[PDB]
Each structure stands twice: as structure tokens, then as C-alpha cells.
């Protein structure tokens, strides 16, 4: 069936790996390398194609933030460049609505973006939309009921517990209920119509706690914590379960992949990546 793809990441330098995990049989497959190494990117899927968005190439030869959008077709095992964003976005967050990719926040050098732009695959074109109310890098992004949510992050000075949401039909952002915890570099995704925020950095320590937002009650509630605290993790959903991949915990680069089963409210470590890394892009198709 569908596979969990992880692209890029960092360990000693930004990485070029593309690897796919099959949860059904527990196997990993190494696929075509990214054309340029990337960490701090985000992954998403539209129409069966995997996109790698933003990030940076941090190596001993220097750092270059990325405005790149690249597309991987599992059917060809090839990467194809697409149109670049208006600005480089390291530690970007992305979400998909109506088959368009929204690129949210991130940084370019010391600039922490509030800007947001939208990609239309059929036209290979990016368009700026209304900026967020807050500058946010290491921002978690998810889509619920065709609204875009931007959760936590770092504004250039402070790590954030705030969250906001974007209504495309009005092209407007509004603040929602703040999280219980400050989280920069959390994994944020939607599962069964709730927005989950897992891990992150609270300004002092990495987190293993996980909370979920219900738009109906406007409340964030804690669920079972992950076994391993982590920030700059990748998060995705496969067959109704959340998977978190890698990250950093202040001491090590995680290879751990943990799986959250909402039906039992438990996490387990289901596999490990081929090597420890943070700042991966991850998506499922």
C-alpha cells in the first residue's frame, strides 16, 4: 500500500537521502537522492506526487537557504524541479488545500517570515497570500475542514505557544486558542479531524508531550506522550496512525520512528531510520 517517504534532514551536514518505509512489512527502501541536499524542509503530497519544499543546504562549504520546490514521482523514481518560491524558507511549514500547496513562514538568514504563498501544480506558479499575524519559523502546519492552521514556532525572539488559522475564501488569518505548551519545531498534523502537536522545544528543553486541538470545543488537550522527546521531527499520518520521525533532543540526533495509535492512545517505537537525523521532510503516498 502507501509508503512513508522521508527526504533530506541533517547529521553533520544537510542530507540528500530519500527513503521509504513500509509499515505493513517493516521494510525500508532507498530511493533517488535529492538533487541538492536539504534540511529544515517540508514534505507534502498532491495527486500522488511528493513535493520537497524550502529548507537549506548547510554544509562545511557554507549555508544556502532554499526557495526550491522539487517534485518526486514514485512511479518514475525521479525528481523534477518546479518553480521556486518568492523567498527562501528554512524551517518552513506546509499544508495542502484544494490541491494547492501553502508554504508558511520559515527563515531566510536572520529574516523570520510572516509571509505565506500558494503553489498551483497545474500552472507551476506561486502566488503570495495574506501574511500570518506572527512571524514563525519551525512552524507546524495542518489543514482541517479546508482551513489552514499555523501552530507554534519561533518569531525571531521568542518561542511560541500561539496558533492562528487562515480562511482562504476571505484571505484572512485569525488567532485561535493558544497551546498549553510553548512549542517550536513541533510535528503538527491532522488526524481524525483534530490537529495534533507533538514534541518541539519550549525554550529550555525538548518535549515529549503531545496535545490535540478540537475546533468544536476550541480546546487543546494532552494525549499520551511520546517515549522520546524531540524537536525538528517529521510527522505524518498513515492508515489512521501518526508517525514521528527523527529529530534532535539536545544530546543526540534521533533515528527513532514512533507510531501513535489513537484507538488505544499509545505510542510505540516501530522502526528506526537508517541513521539519526533532524529536520526531515516527510509525506505519505
Amino acid at each position: 500500500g502507501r509508503l512513508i517517504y522521508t527526504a533530506g534532514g541533517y547529521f553533520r551536514q544537510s542530507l540528500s537521502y530519500l527513503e521509504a518505509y513500509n509499515p505493513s512489512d517493516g521494510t525500508w527502501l532507498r530511493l533517488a537522492d535529492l538533487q541538492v541536499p536539504r534540511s529544515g524542509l517540508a514534505g507534502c503530497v498532491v495527486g500522488g506526487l511528493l513535493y520537497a519544499v524550502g529548507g537549506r543546504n548547510n554544509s562545511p562549504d557554507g549555508n544556502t537557504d532554499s526557495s526550491a520546490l522539487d517534485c518526486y514521482n514514485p512511479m518514475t523514481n525521479q525528481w523534477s524541479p518546479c518553480a521556486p518560491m518568492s523567498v527562501p524558507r528554512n524551517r518552513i511549514g506546509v499544508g495542502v488545500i484544494d490541491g494547492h500547496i501553502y508554504a508558511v513562514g520559515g527563515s531566510h538568514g536572520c529574516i523570520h517570515h510572516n509571509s505565506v504563498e500558494r503553489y498551483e501544480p497545474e500552472r507551476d506558479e506561486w502566488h503570495l497570500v495574506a501574511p500570518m499575524l506572527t512571524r514563525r519559523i519551525g512552524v507546524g502546519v495542518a489543514v482541517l475542514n479546508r482551513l489552514l492552521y499555523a501552530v507554534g514556532g519561533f518569531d525571531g525572539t521568542n518561542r511560541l505557544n500561539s496558533a492562528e488559522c487562515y480562511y482562504p475564501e476571505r484571505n484572512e488569518w485569525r488567532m485561535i486558542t493558544a497551546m498549553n505548551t510553548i512549542r517550536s519545531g513541533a510535528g503538527v498534523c491532522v488526524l481524525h479531524n483534530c490537529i495534533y502537536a507533538a514534541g518541539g522545544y519550549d525554550g529550555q528543553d525538548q518535549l515529549n508531550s503531545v496535545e490535540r486541538y478540537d475546533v468544536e470545543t476550541e480546546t487543546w488537550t494532552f494525549v499520551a506522550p511520546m517515549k522520546h522527546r524531540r524537536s525538528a521531527l517529521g510527522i505524518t499520518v498513515h492508515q489512521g496512525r501518526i508517525y514521528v520521525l527523527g529529530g534532535y533532543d539536545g544530546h543526540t540526533f534521533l533515528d527513532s520512528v514512533e507510531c501513535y495509535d489513537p484507538d488505544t492512545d499509545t505510542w510505540s517505537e516501530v522502526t528506526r531510520m537508517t541513521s539519526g537525523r533532524s529536520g526531515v521532510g516527510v509525506a505519505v503516498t
Binding site: 541533517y10 534540511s39 548547510n58 524551517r91 519551525g138 517550536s184 519545531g185 539536545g250 540526533f253
Partner: peptide, 16 residues
């Protein structure tokens, strides 16, 4: 301009 030592990112673990 001064070839400064790299600094650790507390959130990502990257050195820059």
C-alpha cells in the same frame, strides 16, 4: 568577517 566559531541551534542541532 572574523571567521567566528560555529554556533549550535538548540532546536535542530545544526551548527552555523
Amino acid at each position: 568577517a572574523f571567521f567566528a566559531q560555529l554556533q549550535l541551534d538548540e532546536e535542530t542541532g545544526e551548527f552555523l
